[PDB]
Amino acid sequence: XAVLX
Amino acid sequence: XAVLX
Amino acid sequence: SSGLRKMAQPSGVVEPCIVRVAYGNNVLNGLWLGDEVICPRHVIASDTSRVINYENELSSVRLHNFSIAKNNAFLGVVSAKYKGVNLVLKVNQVNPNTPEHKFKSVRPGESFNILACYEGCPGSVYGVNMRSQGTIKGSFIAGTCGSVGYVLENGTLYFVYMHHLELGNGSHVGSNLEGEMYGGYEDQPSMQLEGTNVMSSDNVVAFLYAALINGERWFVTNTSMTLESYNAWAKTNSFTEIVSTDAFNMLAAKTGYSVEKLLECIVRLNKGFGGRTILSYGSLCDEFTPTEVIRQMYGV
Amino acid sequence: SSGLRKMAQPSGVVEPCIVRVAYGNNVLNGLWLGDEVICPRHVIASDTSRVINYENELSSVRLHNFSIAKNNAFLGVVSAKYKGVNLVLKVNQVNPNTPEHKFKSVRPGESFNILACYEGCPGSVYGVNMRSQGTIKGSFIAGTCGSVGYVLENGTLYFVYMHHLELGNGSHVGSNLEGEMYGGYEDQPSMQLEGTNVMSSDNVVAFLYAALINGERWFVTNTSMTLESYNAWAKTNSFTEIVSTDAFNMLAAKTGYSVEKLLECIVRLNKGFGGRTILSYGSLCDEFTPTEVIRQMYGV
Ligand SMILES: [Zn+2]
Ligand SMILES: [Zn+2]
Numbered sequence: 001x002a003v004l005x
Numbered sequence: 006x007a008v009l010x
Numbered sequence: 011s012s013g014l015r016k017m018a019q020p021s022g023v024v025e026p027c028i029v030r031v032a033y034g035n036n037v038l039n040g041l042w043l044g045d046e047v048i049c050p051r052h053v054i055a056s057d058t059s060r061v062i063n064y065e066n067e068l069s070s071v072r073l074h075n076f077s078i079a080k081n082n083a084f085l086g087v088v089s090a091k092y093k094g095v096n097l098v099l100k101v102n103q104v105n106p107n108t109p110e111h112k113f114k115s116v117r118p119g120e121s122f123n124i125l126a127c128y129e130g131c132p133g134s135v136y137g138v139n140m141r142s143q144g145t146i147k148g149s150f151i152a153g154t155c156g157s158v159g160y161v162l163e164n165g166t167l168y169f170v171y172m173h174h175l176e177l178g179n180g181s182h183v184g185s186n187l188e189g190e191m192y193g194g195y196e197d198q199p200s201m202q203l204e205g206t207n208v209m210s211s212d213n214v215v216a217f218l219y220a221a222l223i224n225g226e227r228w229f230v231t232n233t234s235m236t237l238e239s240y241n242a243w244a245k246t247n248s249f250t251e252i253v254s255t256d257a258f259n260m261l262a263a264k265t266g267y268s269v270e271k272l273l274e275c276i277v278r279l280n281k282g283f284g285g286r287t288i289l290s291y292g293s294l295c296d297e298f299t300p301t302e303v304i305r306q307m308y309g310v
Numbered sequence: 311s312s313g314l315r316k317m318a319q320p321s322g323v324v325e326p327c328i329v330r331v332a333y334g335n336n337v338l339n340g341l342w343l344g345d346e347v348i349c350p351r352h353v354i355a356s357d358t359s360r361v362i363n364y365e366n367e368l369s370s371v372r373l374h375n376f377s378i379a380k381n382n383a384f385l386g387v388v389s390a391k392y393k394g395v396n397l398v399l400k401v402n403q404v405n406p407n408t409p410e411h412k413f414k415s416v417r418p419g420e421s422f423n424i425l426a427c428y429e430g431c432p433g434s435v436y437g438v439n440m441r442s443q444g445t446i447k448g449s450f451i452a453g454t455c456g457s458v459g460y461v462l463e464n465g466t467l468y469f470v471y472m473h474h475l476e477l478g479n480g481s482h483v484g485s486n487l488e489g490e491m492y493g494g495y496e497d498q499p500s501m502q503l504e505g506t507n508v509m510s511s512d513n514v515v516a517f518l519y520a521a522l523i524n525g526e527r528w529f530v531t532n533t534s535m536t537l538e539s540y541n542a543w544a545k546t547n548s549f550t551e552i553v554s555t556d557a558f559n560m561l562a563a564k565t566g567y568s569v570e571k572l573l574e575c576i577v578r579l580n581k582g583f584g585g586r587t588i589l590s591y592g593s594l595c596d597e598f599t600p601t602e603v604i605r606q607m608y609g610v
Contacts, residue, residue, distance in 0.1 A: 001478040002495065002502040004358040005450035006178040007195065007202040009058040010150035011480030013447060015316070017434035020425065022322035125320065134317035135435050147313060151609040180311030285585030292587040309451040
């Protein structure tokens with residue numbers, strides 16, 4: 001659930 | 006009532 | 011999950027134009043463009059608590075009392091003049107960091123930026139929104155007179171605001187740079203009073219689209235209001251009338267809620283939020299344009 | 311009548327350090343200081359949706375694919391390296407507008423500034439506040455990866471933040487510039503989840519002093535809470551413990567309300583505002599420090 005910027 | 010800046 | 015908060019456009023092109031203008035022990039901010047400096051005229055007033063004969067204080071002006079400072083530069087006043095409620099001083103040095111720029115007036119409902127500066131030194135940056143009575147809600151600490159408002163478009167730099175007085179309710183009145191006062195308030199410590207601001211419906215509808223986008227929907231109704239009914243109601247309730255659905259047509263298809271539906275919300279919600287919140291606000295704010303809302307939920 | 315709103319410190323010293331860093335079709339922001347450029351490492355990742363073997367993608371890196379741009383300058387990468395979750399690229403040109411600067415980490419409860427930049431181009435400026443779980447509430451549109459956080463003190467420029475990932479609740483996780491991630495979150499599109507943030511009591515007390523100063527007093531109680539009772543309650547209610555009354559002693563004498571009295575308010579108000587508002591907020595925000603509040607109600 002972590003989205004890479 | 007108007008205060009000069 | 012995003013939230014809806016003011017942002018300001020970066021202040022870098024503006025900061026090198028902000029000068030310290032002093033006369034006697036009067037210190038305030040000034041705007042240094044080309045070989046000219048623009049500042050509020052009261053820096054020459056002998057006193058700022060009763061009405062000043064400003065034309066007499068222009069005859070009275072002494073150029074050696076001017077202490078104008080910017081970085082390592084000390085700017086000597088060649089000549090002085092009025093352009094409305096502001097001074098226009100010609101100085102002996104051209105600002106080497108003058109940006110391409112223009113002057114315009116900001117309209118009611120439009121967002122712009124304040125660069126709040128204490129006696130030459132820029133201090134903070136934040137977004138505001140011009141209101142129909144020609145006032146804004148600043149944070150203007152003593153020292154920030156002549157602080158400058160601006161907005162960037164395309165990306166043309168527009169200078170739009172220079173800070174002057176505070177009214178009893180805390181509303182802030184500035185001038186544009188042609189030296190005309192917003193709202194028509196005179197440049198005097200006189201009894202002046204703010205009328206009633208008409209809310210920007212375009213902005214409020216944008217606010218509500220933001221909330222929907224965010225996933226906040228408790229306020230949405232089983233009914234709606236036609237464009238022509240809203241405007242009829244708007245006219246007697248201090249709201250602006252809506253011209254076209256067109257600027258909302260992306261926001262409308264993306265949420266699935268028509269403008270007609272958000273119109274009735276405005277009418278009901280105006281009677282109070284009933285203790286709940288929308289995007290954490292306690293009531294309808296009209297401070298975000300449809301452009302601001304799109305740009306922060308979707309980008310570009 | 312003032313109101314209580316975030317302000318950001320001017321962005322001018324920072325803007326000339328923000329560069330466009332591209333590799334292949336990966337574009338994000340980078341920080342150009344001296345002959346070095348700092349940016350998030352994922353600009354080299356072949357893909358950003360499953361776990362990357364970053365050490366392998368460093369061996370794999372090709373310097374001719376780097377397109378780093380700033381104004382009229384194109385910066386050639388001399389060498390590449392990791393410092394934590396960020397890249398450190400040595401370039402063939404020294405930034406002619408490098409400011410005196412330092413790196414530090416911002417602590418939970420402290421305010422700082424975000425300069426949000428889209429692929430090289432700075433776009434907006436606003437204030438935030440680091441939270442105990444090492445996340446912040448940004449507005450980070452796609453494009454703003456590697457956007458930079460900073461704070462000015464004395465007036466030493468500190469670089470404190472570089473933007474990396476977004477969690478499911480919308481919380482934003484960045485690194486400092488030594489390349490350590492705030493909160494300890496790993497630089498991967500993995501299942502990561504934010505714990506519970508402990509509220510800054512110092513900030514909340516400041517918030518309440520602001521309201522009192524503003525003339526808002528409906529929440530003030532006929533009773534109070536000792537410093538040691540508050541801390542005992544704070545420990546089991548996700549609030550920080552208060553060390554000293556000392557930073558509030560001006561604010562206390564100026565309103566006539568002791569900290570003890572605002573402690574009990576925090577306890578009652580935490581159970582809900584009961585539909586009313588304080589400074590237009592719907593609940594206790596802990597985003598304003600005692601320093602911010604003083605500075606905007608009184609100046610300097
Ligand atoms: Zn004035
Ligand atoms: Zn990352």
